[PDB]
């Protein structure tokens, strides 16, 4: 359900989240719809940037 970011990721498009290494992301293909309690945003993240909690 929850995954942790392995690396920093920066997004400039409204569909994708930016996140920092170590950020916990709730998972709502290659890109997963996720929610960040840190920022309150919901958006896609690349699955190769995260690992299970």
């Amino acid at each position: 359900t929850t995954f942790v970011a392995l690396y920093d990721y920066e997004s400039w498009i409204e569909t994708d989240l930016s996140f920092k290494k170590g950020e916990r992301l709730q998972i709502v293909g290659n890109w997963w719809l996720a929610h960040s309690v840190t920022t309150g945003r919901t958006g896609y993240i690349p699955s190769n940037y995260v690992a299970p909690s």
């Binding site: 990721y9 293909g29 290659n30 719809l33 690349p46």
Partner: peptide, 10 residues
């Protein structure tokens, strides 16, 4: 949106 190719690592 989910089926896009994976981006490279940093």
């Amino acid at each position: 949106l989910a089926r896009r190719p994976l981006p490279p690592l940093p």
